[PDB]
Amino acid sequence: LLDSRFGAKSISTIAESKRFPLHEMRDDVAFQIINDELYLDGNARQNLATFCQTWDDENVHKLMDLSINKNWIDKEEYPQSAAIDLRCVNMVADLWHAPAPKNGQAVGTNTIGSSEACMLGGMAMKWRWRKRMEAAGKPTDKPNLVCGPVQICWHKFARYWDVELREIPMRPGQLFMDPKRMIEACDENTIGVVPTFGVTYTGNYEFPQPLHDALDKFQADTGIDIDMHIDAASGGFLAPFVAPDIVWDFRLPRVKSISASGHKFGLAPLGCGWVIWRDEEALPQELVFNVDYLGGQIGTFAINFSRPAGQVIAQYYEFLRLGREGYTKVQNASYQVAAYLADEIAKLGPYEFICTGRPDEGIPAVCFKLKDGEDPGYTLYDLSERLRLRGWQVPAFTLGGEATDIVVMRIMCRRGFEMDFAELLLEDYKASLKYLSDHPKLQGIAQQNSFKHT
Amino acid sequence: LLDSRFGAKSISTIAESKRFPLHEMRDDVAFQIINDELYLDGNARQNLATFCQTWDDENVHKLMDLSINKNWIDKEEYPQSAAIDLRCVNMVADLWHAPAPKNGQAVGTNTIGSSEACMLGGMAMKWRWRKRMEAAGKPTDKPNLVCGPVQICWHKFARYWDVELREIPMRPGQLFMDPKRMIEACDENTIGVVPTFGVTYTGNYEFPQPLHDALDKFQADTGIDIDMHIDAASGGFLAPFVAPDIVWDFRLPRVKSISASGHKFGLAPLGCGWVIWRDEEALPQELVFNVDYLGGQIGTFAINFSRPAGQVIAQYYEFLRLGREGYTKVQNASYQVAAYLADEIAKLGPYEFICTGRPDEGIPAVCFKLKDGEDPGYTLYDLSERLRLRGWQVPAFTLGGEATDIVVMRIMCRRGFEMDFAELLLEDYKASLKYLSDHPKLQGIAQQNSFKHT
Amino acid sequence: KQVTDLRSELLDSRFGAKSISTIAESKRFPLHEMRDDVAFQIINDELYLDGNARQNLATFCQTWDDENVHKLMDLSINKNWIDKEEYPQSAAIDLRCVNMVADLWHAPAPKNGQAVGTNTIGSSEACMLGGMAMKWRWRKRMEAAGKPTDKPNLVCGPVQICWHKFARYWDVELREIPMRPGQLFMDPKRMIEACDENTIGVVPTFGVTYTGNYEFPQPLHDALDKFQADTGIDIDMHIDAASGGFLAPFVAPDIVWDFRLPRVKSISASGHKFGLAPLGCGWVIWRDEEALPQELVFNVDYLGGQIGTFAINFSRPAGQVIAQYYEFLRLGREGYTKVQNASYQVAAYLADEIAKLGPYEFICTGRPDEGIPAVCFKLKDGEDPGYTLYDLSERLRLRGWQVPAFTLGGEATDIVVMRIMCRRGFEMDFAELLLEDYKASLKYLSDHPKLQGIAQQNSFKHT
Amino acid sequence: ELLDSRFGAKSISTIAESKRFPLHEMRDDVAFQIINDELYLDGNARQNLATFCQTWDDENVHKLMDLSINKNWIDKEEYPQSAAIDLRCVNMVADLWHAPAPKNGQAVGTNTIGSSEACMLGGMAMKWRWRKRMEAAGKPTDKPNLVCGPVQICWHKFARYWDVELREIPMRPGQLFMDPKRMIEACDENTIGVVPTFGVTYTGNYEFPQPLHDALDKFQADTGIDIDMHIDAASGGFLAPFVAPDIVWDFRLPRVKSISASGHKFGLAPLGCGWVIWRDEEALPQELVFNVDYLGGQIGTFAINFSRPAGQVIAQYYEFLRLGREGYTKVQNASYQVAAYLADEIAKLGPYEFICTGRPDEGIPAVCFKLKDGEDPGYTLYDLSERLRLRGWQVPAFTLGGEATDIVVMRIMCRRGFEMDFAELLLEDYKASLKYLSDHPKLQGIAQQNSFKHT
Ligand SMILES: Cc1ncc(COP(=O)(O)O)c(C)c1O
Ligand SMILES: Cc1ncc(COP(=O)(O)O)c(C)c1O
Ligand SMILES: Cc1ncc(COP(=O)(O)O)c(C)c1O
């Protein structure tokens, strides 16, 4: 066998792909082989399912390229990267109205993503709860966590750390965690409540303030003092700029910690998350580990150890070049696209909207389902497939709880998906509808849910 | 205030370094500002403390640059990256003699580094142990883990997952976990034993074979069946090439899982780890989460979620271009440098070596201390400072346990630190000794341990 | 009660500034200037909507990427092919290429020092030039015989659209032998039935666009010899070797289709196809000076003497010619043979593997002696696997592949075929992946019977 | 035996076996370096003042072209966005030339490789429209002719390739262009159309369509013969719309059925871009349009070429977007200022008669002059041209055709990149050349070879 690229004896990556290669290969050949098959990956420009950054900025490529070997954990060898990281933590803390540091540094850390950030927040929540119950002479064998339609990372947290997950079910007419059902699930064993400030499946905000009021009333009626951790994976970098009046952060006494994804609306490249604590008291010191350096010793609360510092640096770049002024315009642009799509899509079929891209209701997303008892001659799964033939990935999937019978389509509007592209989407959307109308036999055939976790 | 680079009003990164920036800034100015202060970071070429890759390969830079937005978790949009990842898992499994897969795919996963890989391995160990104790209706709230001079990630595991850490103390003449002391620490609550195949502090291997025999005798005498997880962060990509005869992997029945760092001797860029399980039985399905995609559901056992796929791609590039043939030559080269330094350094002072860079004893490292009761006229702390003035970072620190009075110097030889550089280090080493000899007052002044964790 | 902080103007999320739409007023010439880098990023971003064709198995055009070719093209962006004066070296390289192509096709040794031929933008222009020369030669004959040159016709088989254009644009009656069950190509018998005194020439297609098969000029050549013997009518040929011209000379030297045949007066082929050159390169060679009527050649003055030219286009980039030369130099016969063979191996593999998956009748199986590296098949007559090739094609698109399904012409206007093209870059590993997706598609069609018959639109087949 | 000093290895000659297809292969990086090194023998054209084609370098254009190397212009299916951008360009150029508003929203026209193909297409459409008006009237369609002035060679090629009698009004002292009177004298019932050249290749002057249009209206009034026009605005098409909007030469004139122009000339696009627009659907005989199938339905195409790169269209769009009318006006005016400056400055150096002085109202940014009849300054423009070449400049000296055969002119083209600073350097070298010819009289009359003048 020969290879038409190299004009020589073929080298297959498939052949013995299950055994460690025995011989050396020319470097440039290995590179070209891998480079060529990476073309099979999509570029996500037409993928409207993910929240993760997919746009390309030359300066970010340069900063990442320069940081390939900078080790985030090695404060000693990379002092400047460590300094930039500390600045970011303070800036994010400031953004969320965290109390002014009693020293000079906010309590928090950078992470690989919201998953780790949530685990750290969850562990701290569990430890604070354990300390309290112990100080009351009560048991700590059956901890539980109250939440709404959370992302899979919380299911993982509950499973990995043995905490009963009390997830309020999504239901027709009540898809999110409301004050009433939240309280019904709370007790002395509840380590905390986790509102999701930007639900993954729909894009809506679960508002912490009303929930906070209910928890105040709860402590008043029972003496049970319950705190909150806000999972603001997406909303944490949206509301502070486009909807400052929504009180969801550290302005609320019970909010002990907050986490968010830098690689989502934080605009950072893949591999960046943040978790901030209200103050030192909010973070049990037993979870922090002190490691020595020539410059002294620094404490860290992290699951990972060695890793690249490039994303942190790129995140700092976004903070510096944009500021509140810049983020407000960037985020607003996405909301305008989402709002436009929602209004335009509503004129094309019998739809019921769950999220319409309004800044006061959630993130830049459009989420809808077909109206109950309405048959346009296709399902959202069918429409989703027609759109794929046009290059778009618009996820169609079912909701959980008793809403398992609810099929929705969610469209995410992130940086790069400008108004001109949304108009193209609408063109293909209409073309797909006409095709489905001209070929009725297509209805009901497609029935596989698309990736919806991120 | 003006800036001499831009010839315009000064823009400080320190002034408002604790608040989120208010205004926008020209993108390129923000880039140059950050680019300029990153020069304050070292390049680590003269840093002989870390195990992490610090050499630069143009092809790796290109692959990483192309992968900046490729999401490791999104199998749907990046199918080829996911396929390459699967190949790597199988190749690493093959490298460690894992039993041939039933379905065709080995059981394991890529990780951010060895920390995450060890957590996963640790959780699986805890779960397998629990499933046994639970069947016998015994308490499962006081699990313990037996190990030697482990890296900090195991202390974190113990703390975060409430497992008693039974670390055999480092002591004069017995710095590692031996069969006798290991058994003395084992009981029905031991979830497993963790040998460190390449101790972080010294570079020596803890040999699993003798420990394995002791565990066989243990089960024979008590009925208690204890398994092992090999922390081969560094050794996992060394012995298979330069010392195939050392039996430390899956060839041993009790070894249920193994973890290693790709960004160490695996030659991958920062942000790559690996953990492999012997077979399906070794990994409790309760820990695996299944997520749906268009092409079907894929299960995952990971702490992190969204993150970049570049390192895995880069790792595959190393596997392809080198093979066993290439890795053997690369690792041998490092061992030759280490062996050379050990031999040469021994001629310069009254030293007792703990590791001399021998392939059959450990990793490419040199570790020594001053002979007991010997006073050359300086401490290794003093020598370390002298070498810093020459641009080298050669860590001097104390050991734990009873060897708390012992101060050692550890030199790590990784790719890029060639024979010519070792010669220069020897020159500076001699120069340092002469200076210390001509300036006696320096003795005893330096007393701060250097970063030793990685 | 408001809680937001909004701006009252459409914004762009990339630039954090007022939005600039390319769709708004995209029907009027822009009025104002715009920052250069912004215009660049705006265009760069929408170009991501284009496919990269790596998974497109319909085209014959080069889609692989070679760094050196990128550099040569980048350096030649302003080099004008027609300006021999300012770009002497590009002109020299072009002359070398003409000679090398002429040599490759066994053209008679130049009666001076340079072969008769020219580079073109593609096979279309090359064919037009060959067609005009053919018409002119024929006209000169009839006029010498005192006959009317009022009704010229051209005999051919299932030619590519460029010949339909030539016939239309130069008023030549196109006598295309119909594609039919049992015989989809131009055979000697039907060819002769279409020939007469007004036939300007015959155009065999050495690598049919629609199927990939070669129309063999030798048997046709014999028939034309017999024809002149029985009627005195002397008819010549122009070989449309768009794809085959850079295949057979390397993997099947024994096939006599070129200038080795007396009647072959000119040949054309595409450099940007199997010639391996980047888009925008074609070639047409004539047997000798006599084969090219000087009335079609235009002489322009240059600072160092006047050079003759026979082309439709004038000013244009010389980069593709340079890149073509680079392929000739780095590969040679030795290299082209290996590159082409690699594609044949992939095609042959797919044909053999695909045959095991359904009731198919193959028209082309990627054999070097029969045609180009392509696989062409249809469902066996009176066989119903539970899907049409159109349905299969759509399922493959959902997996990212573009495998064209379309109908044949003539009496085969009712037959639907699927054609797979194997060009440089589509290596064995990718063919395996295609097979995996092919099988997955079949299982899906099997589990979802309602899909059968829904898809009914032909894919782009002309190139 | 023979070695190469670059590779320190056996020599690899491109001259040896340069007429025979190479037999063996060689290292790719060696093949690249060998070709890269001889390409240095090509000029960079920065000092070439003969061509109209773009020669300046813009980094963004290099990037767009590099990204487009494999984008196939004809493959609408695989490259949808490239096709969309192309449609926008057609509409924008149509709007630029005042084409009537489309009935369906899309203007009638197409991108081409250059003005040559654009002119062929325009010419075929002209021939077809004339033929049909003829067949519908039951007349003979076998003797067509085309009336024009000092046309570029592409029209001679069209005439020859499509069997149309070319009636070119001869260039003559005093009246080097096609005037209304001589145009009419050449028109008849077999005239498929008139082709004014809005920017004559040889001189740079505009042939004004308006006066010719009036004569054609009177012609139809007196004879009933209705003749249309195709404007060859290869260079002028991207000049007058910005610096001289008041000149009526485009679709504002009823008889102008089609217009063609070069994007790679003053359109500022890279080599390989042309444009041809038709007034409306009726102006383009559908018999010439071919419809091909593709998943999205079917698209009609009228072009001689088929597969080709879409990079130039994309680059052309980039110029349209970044400049707009505002930008083009400033860019074009800058070239006119240089031309006007050179004309006025050169006039002070010798006994010259100017035929083009770079005035926006008269033509393109070019300077064209000849020596005053009988004035012998002691050299010919051929001699001057050679002296300028020794200083690195290529300033073409050549003879006019028709009845202007005795005339030797020098033409200077001012395109983007040739700024005022460079013009001053040219003037310095021009003066130095004059002084040298003055001090070395024996040089007079020696040079006598015309330079490339077609493009
Ligand atoms: C609410 C929410 N939390 C957590 C995550 C996981 O974040 P990451 O992928 O960065 O771990 C997501 C995607 C999310 O939408
Ligand atoms: C034995 C050992 N285990 C684990 C680690 C941590 O690995 P990582 O920094 O890649 O998480 C190190 C550095 C080590 O030396
Ligand atoms: C047989 C045949 N001839 C001519 C052409 C046209 O070639 P080009 O697109 O290069 O003009 C093609 C595509 C073809 O397949």
Ligand SMILES: Cc1ncc(COP(=O)(O)O)c(C)c1O
């Ligand atoms: C008036 C005129 N028409 C046509 C052309 C031919 O243009 P192209 O070289 O771009 O085919 C030129 C150079 C010209 O000056």
